[PDB]
């Protein structure tokens, strides 16, 4: 399940999020996102 990363060691992130893209993932937020998306998809011979 876990991905394979080219670099053996990761690096520290910097700079504001409009010159390079980084995804941030609070686990609770992601669970809410999944539940809401799954519900609303069904909500919307």
């Amino acid at each position: 399940s876990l991905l394979h990363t080219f670099w053996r060691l990761p690096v520290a992130v910097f700079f504001e999020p409009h010159e390079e893209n980084v995804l941030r993932c609070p686990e609770r937020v992601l669970r809410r996102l999944l539940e809401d998306a799954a519900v609303t998809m069904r909500g919307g011979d």
Partner: protein, 140 residues
């Protein structure tokens, strides 16, 4: 000077011969072999040993200090340096000993400073067809 130790094998003899010849603009002279009677002159031994030691010490000393600094670098290339050193590892203590080793590293580096920098003595102005003679400006 480095190949002086392995001279017995014929590969080393051929490589030394190839290194010995130098080519330049209409110049093809040969420089002298720095070994005599299969032995090294003592100053060459000191310089070669100093370079090889300063190479050897850095291989096993840098890892700890690099991995400690990796937590903080905002320039973020030190982490790539750590990864490069770990890849080199894949390719292959009491504080007093540590401080002595650091002192040894830097004194050995200073010993090699005899050969590291070049005095830019002269810069040249146009030369005669008598080319043995030329004019130049003296620089410190």
């Amino acid at each position: 000077g480095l190949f002086s130790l392995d001279r017995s094998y014929e590969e080393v003899k051929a490589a030394v011969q190839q290194l010995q010849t130098i080519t330049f603009r209409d110049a093809t002279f040969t420089i002298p072999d720095p070994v005599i009677d299969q032995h090294l002159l003592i100053d060459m031994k000191t310089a070669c040993l100093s370079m090889s030691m300063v190479a050897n010490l850095a291989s096993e000393l840098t890892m700890t200090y690099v991995r400690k600094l990796a937590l903080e670098d905002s320039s973020m290339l030190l982490v790539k340096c750590q990864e490069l050193l770990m890849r080199l590892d894949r390719e292959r203590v009491s504080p007093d000993d540590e401080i002595a080793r650091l002192s040894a590293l830097f004194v050995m580096l200073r010993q090699l400073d005899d050969l590291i920098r070049e005095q830019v003595v002269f810069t040249v102005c146009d030369v005669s067809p008598d080319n043995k003679s030329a004019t130049c400006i003296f620089k410190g």
